[PDB]
């Protein structure tokens, strides 16, 4: 009953503004209106979009952007390279405050040659720079003026993607419009509507009854659609993981051996099989969906013997309650989860219950997101992981200079700090050399499991639920709640 020439999907997330200014992550909306100067394939290969070609200098500070010349925004108006120096300077201005401002930080300059030749020199070397530049490009002629962080722009946007905005329902959905001009490729599905469902059982119920034809569905209903011919399922690998942030500046999870002993009480291949529906994989580092990965690495595997054994050899001991003591001090400390995100709500309880049957008493303790402050816990149930550059969640992430503590815009919550993971992060980025890169993250996942600031438990999949009449859907890595499922959906028909 939903028309031939009309696309519905569901997304859990509305954006409040539809701007890449102000996109976290692969946001579903914004990469229909919008295209950055690169793209990525079904393999995450990095490839060319708005952006033709490039040469970078052997120093990696200067890249030459070659445009495409036959780009259209929205509007008719022909993008060049006027454009794409506004887009990094208004990202880079802290008055937008955007989102992007610190991917684009080490930029020096941006010299407009002609119209499809931009220079963009740096002040040091970001091998992450061409995945950085997947970033949509922003209309100068509509936004030069504007006051970007409320302009009337971000609910009516315009953009170079493959679909135009028509109309915005807030709190249901944003329709769209094939854009007849596409440079990629001629788009299929003329009408394109992005449904907000947030609830899993309610986007499944609309799948179901023919509402919507496509949504992510959460693993726990898979059964609704399995052995359903009217329905596909494409299982979607992503580097999205999720993880025991330890708080390093906790009086037990400070010692090593606790949190390896932490790591040994944990059978995360249950979880990945029960809580989990075998939908995922156990998790031991943040790169097992990059190129970055050593391959080669130690494990904490289910020892709950080895983690009581380390426990005894850190000087705690067992006591009349069967739970660990040292000194007079029970081995104790909180377990904090968001209360909105069921699965890490879970997770904790999981971990709570783990660490019982090793004599660890923990307390799971779960809040509204933005209720307080989780760089502040004991430890925190937390998600990272990108499908992009290696250097993305890794360096913001464990770098000890990106301690929240310290930096404002670090994302190190745990406060965690070791000198084999700076210099191994800050070689990796500092040189765009395949080989060096990959030497430099194996020395950095070496000292993860060294000096493990994690207890990582498992990568996600995700599952891309589909109307069968659905047709040309391609998978690739997913990122964080499966976004970029809708990468490919300007090649979808029915």
Same mark, same amino acid.
């Given at each position: 009953?939903?028309?031939?020439?009309?696309?519905?999907?569901?997304?859990?997330?509305?954006?409040?503004? /539809?701007?890449?200014?102000?996109?976290?992550?692969?946001?579903?909306?914004?990469?229909?209106?919008?295209?950055?100067?690169?793209?990525?394939?079904?393999?995450?290969?990095? =490839?060319?979009?708005?952006?033709?070609?490039?040469?970078?200098?052997?120093?990696?500070?200067?890249?030459?952007?070659?445009?495409?010349?036959?780009?259209?925004?929205?509007?008719?108006?022909?993008?060049?390279?006027? !454009?794409?120096?506004?887009?990094?300077?208004?990202?880079?201005?802290? +008055?937008?405050?955007?989102?992007?401002?610190?991917?684009?930080?080490?930029? *020096?300059?941006?010299?407009?040659?002609?119209?499809?030749?931009?220079?963009?020199?740096?002040?040091?070397?970001?091998?992450?720079?061409?995945?950085?530049?997947?970033?949509?490009?922003?209309? =100068?002629?509509?936004?030069?003026?504007?006051?970007?962080?409320?302009?009337?722009?971000? @609910?009516?946007?315009?953009?170079?993607?493959?679909?135009?905005?028509?109309?915005?329902?807030?709190?249901?959905?944003?329709?769209?419009?094939?854009?007849?001009?596409? &440079?990629?490729?001629?788009?299929?599905?003329?009408?394109?509507?992005?449904?907000?469902?947030?609830?899993?059982?309610?986007?499944?119920?609309?799948? +179901?009854?023919?509402?919507?034809?496509?949504?992510?569905?959460?693993?726990?209903?898979?059964?609704?659609?399995?052995?359903?011919?009217?329905?596909?399922?494409?299982?979607?690998?992503?580097?999205?993981?999720?993880?025991?942030?330890?708080? $390093?500046?906790?009086?037990?999870?400070?010692?090593?051996?606790?949190? @390896?002993?932490?790591?040994?009480?944990? !059978? *995360?291949?249950? /979880?990945?099989?029960?809580?989990?529906?075998?939908?995922?994989?156990?998790?031991?580092?943040?790169?097992?969906?990059?190129?970055?990965?050593?391959?080669?690495?130690?494990?904490? *595997? &289910?020892?709950?013997?080895?983690?009581?054994?380390?426990?005894?050899?850190?000087?705690? =001991?067992?006591?009349?309650?069967?739970?660990?003591?040292?000194?007079?001090?029970?081995?104790?400390?909180?377990?904090?989860?968001?209360?909105?995100?069921?699965?890490?709500?879970?997770?904790?309880? /999981? $971990?709570?219950?783990?660490?019982?049957?090793?004599?660890?008493?923990?307390?799971?303790?779960? *809040?509204?997101?933005?209720?307080?402050?989780?760089?502040?816990?004991?430890?925190?149930?937390?998600?990272?992981?990108?499908? $992009?550059?290696?250097?993305?969640?890794?360096?913001?992430?464990?770098?000890?200079?990106?301690?929240?503590?310290?930096?404002?815009?670090?994302?190190?919550?745990?406060?965690?700090?070791?000198?084999?993971?700076?210099?191994?992060? @800050?070689?990796?980025?500092?040189?765009?050399?395949?080989?060096?890169?990959?030497?430099?993250?194996?020395?950095?996942?070496?000292?993860?499991?060294?000096?493990?600031?994690?207890?990582?438990?498992?990568?996600? !999949?995700?599952?891309?639920?589909?109307?069968?009449?659905?047709?040309?859907?391609?998978?690739?890595?997913?990122?964080?709640?499966?976004?970029?499922?809708?990468?490919?959906? &300007?090649?979808?028909?029915?």
């Amino acid at each position: 009953k939903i028309p031939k020439d009309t696309l519905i999907i569901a997304v859990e997330n509305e954006i409040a503004r /539809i701007n890449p200014a102000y996109s976290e992550d692969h946001d579903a909306v914004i990469n229909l209106v919008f295209s950055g100067l690169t793209r990525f394939d079904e393999n995450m290969s990095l =490839k060319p979009d708005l952006a033709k070609s490039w040469d970078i200098s052997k120093d990696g500070l200067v890249y030459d952007i070659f445009l495409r010349d036959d780009v259209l925004w929205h509007d008719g108006v022909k993008f060049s390279a006027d !454009d794409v120096k506004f887009s990094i300077e208004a990202f880079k201005n802290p +008055k937008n405050n955007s989102s992007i401002y610190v991917n684009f930080e080490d930029i *020096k300059s941006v010299e407009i040659l002609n119209p499809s030749h931009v220079k963009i020199t740096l002040f040091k070397p970001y091998p992450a720079f061409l995945d950085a530049l997947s970033i949509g490009m922003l209309p =100068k002629h509509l936004l030069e003026n504007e006051n970007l962080n409320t302009s009337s722009f971000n @609910q009516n946007p315009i953009g170079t993607g493959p679909y135009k905005f028509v109309k915005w329902k807030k709190g249901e959905y944003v329709e769209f419009k094939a854009n007849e001009h596409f &440079y990629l490729d001629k788009v299929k599905t003329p009408r394109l509507i992005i449904k907000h469902i947030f609830d899993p059982s309610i986007a499944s119920a609309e799948l +179901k009854n023919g509402k919507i034809d496509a949504a992510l569905i959460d693993v726990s209903l898979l059964n609704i659609f399995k052995n359903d011919e009217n329905f596909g399922i494409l299982r979607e690998k992503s580097a999205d993981y999720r993880a025991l942030m330890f708080n $390093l500046d906790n009086e037990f999870l400070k010692d090593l051996k606790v949190r @390896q002993a932490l790591n040994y009480a944990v !059978d *995360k291949e249950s /979880i990945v099989k029960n809580l989990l529906h075998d939908y995922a994989f156990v998790a031991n580092h943040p790169l097992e969906r990059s190129w970055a990965n050593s391959k080669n690495f130690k494990i904490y *595997k &289910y020892d709950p013997k080895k983690a009581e054994d380390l426990l005894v050899s850190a000087g705690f =001991k067992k006591n009349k309650d069967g739970n660990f003591e040292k000194d007079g001090k029970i081995l104790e400390f909180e377990i904090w989860a968001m209360s909105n995100d069921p699965l890490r709500v879970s997770l904790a309880g /999981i $971990l709570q219950s783990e660490f019982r049957k090793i004599g660890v008493v923990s307390k799971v303790v779960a *809040k509204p997101a933005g209720s307080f402050d989780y760089s502040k816990v004991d430890s925190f149930l937390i998600g990272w992981g990108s499908p $992009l550059d290696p250097d993305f969640h890794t360096f913001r992430v464990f770098e000890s200079s990106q301690d929240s503590a310290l930096n404002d815009e670090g994302w190190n919550f745990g406060h965690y700090h070791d000198k084999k993971v700076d210099i191994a992060l @800050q070689k990796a980025r500092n040189t765009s050399n395949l080989e060096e890169r990959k030497k430099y993250y194996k020395d950095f996942i070496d000292a993860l499991y060294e000096n493990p600031p994690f207890i990582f438990l498992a990568y996600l !999949d995700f599952a891309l639920v589909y109307n069968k009449d659905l047709k040309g859907i391609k998978t690739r890595t997913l990122g964080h709640h499966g976004v970029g499922f809708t990468w490919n959906v &300007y090649e979808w028909s029915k």
